[PDB]
Design a protein around this ligand. Structure first.
Ligand SMILES: *[C@@H]1O[C@H](CO)[C@@H](O[C@@H]2O[C@H](CO)[C@@H](O[C@@H]3O[C@H](CO)[C@@H](O)[C@H](O)[C@@H]3O)[C@H](O)[C@H]2NC(C)=O)[C@H](O)[C@H]1NC(C)=O
Ligand SMILES: *[C@@H]1O[C@H](CO)[C@@H](O[C@@H]2O[C@H](CO)[C@@H](O[C@H]3O[C@H](CO)[C@@H](O)[C@H](O)[C@@H]3O)[C@H](O)[C@H]2NC(C)=O)[C@H](O)[C@H]1NC(C)=O
Ligand SMILES: *[C@@H]1O[C@H](CO)[C@@H](O[C@@H]2O[C@H](CO)[C@@H](O[C@H]3O[C@H](CO)[C@@H](O)[C@H](O)[C@@H]3O)[C@H](O)[C@H]2NC(C)=O)[C@H](O)[C@H]1NC(C)=O
Ligand SMILES: *[C@@H]1O[C@H](CO)[C@@H](O)[C@H](O)[C@H]1NC(C)=O
Lengths: 60, 49
């Protein structure tokens, strides 16, 4: 997360600010990429939504 | 409010100006350094008066 923390209600995953529960869809804007999946202890699988793709999908 | 200790240390790394990925990718080394530092505190107290 760029700022905040990943949380899950049980089924879906969100990123929210640490001091107030404001869940949001995990997108490329909310997060940053660093390395791969093999080095972080406790990492989980989840899709990261790309805001640009639906715009180009309508373009296609 | 409970929080995993690694996540808390990532918060503190953000506090000092270092990104979380540094801690999450050097967690083993950081934990070993902290444990060795605590052991050295033990030795210093038990030797120096
Ligand atoms: C950044 O700093 C840390 C030290 O705080 C470096 O970790 C240290 O790396 C050396 C070499 O990999 C380790 O020495 C090795 O110790 C093992 C012990 O079994 C020994 O078998 C090897 O032959 C070697 O002597 C050292 O233990 C390790 N220190 C700790 C606390 O884990 C790290 O490599 C540095 N990283 C970079 C990119 O500079
Ligand atoms: C954890 O957070 C999830 C996101 O809120 C939530 O999934 C959401 O569940 C509700 C139903 O309670 C869905 O709401 C929609 O339901 C129908 C489905 O077609 C729509 O017609 C409605 O207008 C309404 O928008 C959400 O669509 C659904 N979100 C997703 C991505 O599936 C989970 O239920 C939450 N889990 C728990 C245990 O609370
Ligand atoms: C999170 O996502 C990872 C990728 O989807 C997933 O790793 C995948 O795990 C399966 C089986 O555990 C592997 O499938 C193949 O694994 C070996 C090859 O080493 C084969 O012998 C098996 O028969 C099977 O075909 C995937 O290769 C592996 N994907 C990668 C990129 O390594 C994790 O399991 C997921 N983590 C959790 C908690 O679900
Ligand atoms: C957290 O605790 C459970 C059991 O107490 C364990 O299975 C799990 O591996 C732990 N999570 C991590 C990242 O080690």
């Amino acid at each position: 997360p760029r700022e905040g923390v990943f949380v899950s209600n049980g089924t879906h995953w969100f990123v929210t600010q640490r001091n107030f529960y404001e869940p949001q869809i995990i997108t490329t804007d909310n997060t940053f990429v660093s390395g791969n999946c093999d080095v972080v202890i406790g990492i989980v699988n989840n899709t990261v939504y790309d805001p640009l793709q639906p715009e180009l999908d309508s373009f296609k | 409010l409970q929080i995993p200790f690694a996540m808390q240390m990532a918060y503190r790394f953000n506090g000092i100006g270092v990104t979380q990925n540094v801690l999450y990718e050097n967690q083993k080394l950081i934990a070993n350094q902290f444990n060795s530092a605590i052991g050295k505190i033990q030795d210093s107290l038990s030797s120096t008066a």
